[PDB]
Design a protein around this ligand. Structure first.
Ligand SMILES: Cc1ncc(COP(=O)(O)O)c(/C=N/[C@@H](COP(=O)(O)O)C(=O)O)c1O
Length: 382
């Protein structure tokens, strides 16, 4: 028997750990899940179902229900694209677009582009963690409290818009080298914003955010460590690849992406590799000395890409190379991607070049619009 999952979403404030994900891998790999006689005695299982994007849970004595029965494949989007609020537009106006590129890579490597700038608050992938974190937070923290964190840019914009739609106050902390939209947009959205000229990278800002949090009593929502960030991308970004690939007719053979916290490619890779372990995750290690805004090298410390059981390859990419690839997607497809997007296009293009990749469909996750990166656009043409 099928019942509604909303009711059982207290397991989000009770399950801790990753042992619950073993349940995910089996439900996904099997394509079904066993019915639960007592839904409250199985907090791990229930949580797993939510995290793969079920809307319902299977309840009863011995039965089982498919992914489609559970609602992994439910279409959310109103055909007409009419939404009674912005927050509901984020929720139900999904999946973000998967667009097949005219870009031609060798060895029959077919490039598809998941356009995460089609998120309403930050025009970036960072909306999805920011709604998931703040939504859970609304359960426990009182309204009018200040929530805060460090960001390269996207998440601080997403945090500020969403915090303020949930009644919470916002502080964002940015490194000096980040972009003007990040420093400016939160303020337009009513946050306080603090910029450290000395801080060369976002992870380096963390001690300052932690110190101030202890002194001031704001809630440091902490995207690097906060398990919702991984979980948002499991029920949203990753699940969508799973669904779209199937409904799209895609022979899905892999994913390509970029890493800051590692939330979204950890989630795409794990989800996808639960359904089918052969799927490569091609990931980008920005080259040494170069800065690509939004992302970093793994060995600067990342939670999920390390600890979860994820087969992934790295290709090195310079900024200059990430920018070359922006330029060529823009001449191929006429779509203008951000620097981190072109870094994952480039990184796939090399494994393709090398002959390390099977013939088939690859989905790249493009994290934001190039319209926010005019300087790096300009410099890449001169
Ligand atoms: C443009 C762009 N490209 C890639 C990423 C990487 O996504 P993640 O692995 O899910 O954090 C992000 C994620 N952004 C967050 C996290 O950045 P950080 O992890 O501190 O390097 C921010 O803006 O501060 C991004 O904005």
């Amino acid at each position: 028997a099928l019942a509604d999952i909303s009711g059982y979403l207290d397991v989000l404030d009770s399950v801790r750990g990753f042992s619950y994900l073993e349940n995910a891998r089996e439900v996904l790999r099997s394509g079904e899940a066993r019915c639960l006689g007592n839904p409250r005695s199985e907090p791990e299982y229930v949580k797993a179902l939510y995290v793969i994007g079920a809307s319902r849970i299977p309840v009863g004595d011995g039965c089982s229900h498919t992914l489609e029965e559970l609602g992994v494949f439910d279409i959310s989007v109103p055909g007409e694209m009419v939404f009674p609020s912005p927050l509901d537009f984020f929720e139900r106006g999904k999946p973000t677009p998967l667009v097949r590129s005219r870009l031609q890579l060798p060895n029959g490597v077919r490039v598809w582009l998941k356009l995460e700038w089609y998120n309403p608050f930050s025009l970036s992938v960072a909306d999805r963690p920011a709604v998931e974190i703040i939504s859970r937070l609304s359960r426990r923290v009182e309204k009018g409290s200040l929530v805060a964190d460090a960001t390269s840019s996207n998440f601080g914009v997403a945090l500020s818009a969403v915090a303020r739609l949930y009644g919470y106050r916002a502080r964002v902390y940015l490194p000096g080298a980040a972009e003007e939209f990040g420093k400016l947009l939160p303020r337009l959205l009513g946050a306080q914003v603090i910029v450290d000229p000395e801080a060369p990278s976002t992870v380096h800002l963390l001690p300052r955010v932690m110190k101030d949090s202890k002194n001031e009593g704001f809630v440091h929502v902490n995207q690097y460590y906060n398990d919702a960030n991984f979980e948002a991308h499991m029920r949203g970004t990753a699940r969508e690849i799973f669904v779209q690939s199937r409904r799209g007719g895609l022979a899905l053979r892999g994913v390509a992406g970029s890493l800051g916290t590692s939330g979204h490619m950890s989630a795409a890779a794990f989800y996808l590799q639960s359904v089918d372990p052969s799927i490569r995750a091609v990931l980008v290690q920005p080259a040494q000395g170069d800065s690509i805004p939004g992302i970093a090298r793994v060995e600067t410390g990342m939670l999920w890409i390390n600890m979860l059981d994820i087969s992934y390859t790295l290709a090195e990419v310079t900024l200059e190379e990430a920018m070359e690839a922006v330029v060529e997607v823009a001449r191929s497809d006429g779509l203008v991607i951000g620097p981190s997007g072109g870094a994952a296009v480039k990184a796939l293009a090399k494994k393709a070049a090398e002959g390390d990749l099977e013939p088939g469909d690859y989905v790249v996750v493009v994290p934001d619009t190039g319209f926010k990166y005019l300087s790096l656009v300009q410099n890449a043409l001169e």
